[PDB]
């Protein structure tokens, strides 16, 4: 699994994981053309990966709601 095999695996079965992710969705801005279901999903993950890094750059830590939690330890002095 390389974060993409997961993409094709989840896209393979729609009955197991029905949702809006399975198909393309119109954007809020008409200037942008639509994406594929698989492509928009990767784009969403890139956006989230950058969102978490810029939040972690501050003292605030981010968590996924069912998949782990990104924290840091302060030993202090």
């Amino acid at each position: 699994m390389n974060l993409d095999s997961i993409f094709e695996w989840i896209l393979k079965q729609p009955i197991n994981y029905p949702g809006k992710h399975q198909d393309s969705q119109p954007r809020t801005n008409p200037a942008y053309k639509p994406l594929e279901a698989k492509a928009q999903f990767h784009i969403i993950f890139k956006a989230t990966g950058e969102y978490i890094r810029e939040k972690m750059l501050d003292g605030k830590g981010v968590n996924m709601r069912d998949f782990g939690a990104f924290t840091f330890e302060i030993f202090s002095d």
Binding site: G19, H21, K33, Q40, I44, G59, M64, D66
Partner: protein, 136 residues
């Protein structure tokens, strides 16, 4: 997921659905084998048969020990005046986010859009001429 949906210009509901679908990786993990090597940037996290380990970007870790976080830890560093002076549009412009995707030419996009739309909506017939230009 609101800022992410804004950056991707996508729906809040659909982006939440994508997160809820992807967090269902435990179903794949329960099956034997199937090591998950998921990266999405600074953190590189690996899942073996049932063993889990992770690594962090060395530069990202060094940024944390760059010892400038004394200001970020305390909430009183700001003079408490700019909270209403600074607008969120200005703060978001200098934010790292929204720079992932290039901005196309707004004029060009709908120029092409309505242009091709008219072309195809009335490209049904090629026979009719009504303006010949014999000599030229």
């Amino acid at each position: 997921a609101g800022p992410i949906a804004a950056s991707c210009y996508l729906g809040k509901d659909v982006v939440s659905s994508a997160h809820n679908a992807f967090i269902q990786a435990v179903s794949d993990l329960t099956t034997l084998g199937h090591g998950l090597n998921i990266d999405f940037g600074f953190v590189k996290v690996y899942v073996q048969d049932r063993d889990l380990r992770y690594s962090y970007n060395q530069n990202f870790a060094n940024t944390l020990n760059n010892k400038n976080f004394e200001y970020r830890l305390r909430k009183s560093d700001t003079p408490t005046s700019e909270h209403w002076n600074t607008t969120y549009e200005s703060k978001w412009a200098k934010s790292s986010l929204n720079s992932l995707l290039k901005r196309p030419n707004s004029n060009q996009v709908r120029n092409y859009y309505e242009k091709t739309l008219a072309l195809k909506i009335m490209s049904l017939d090629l026979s009719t001429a009504e303006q010949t230009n014999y000599s030229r």
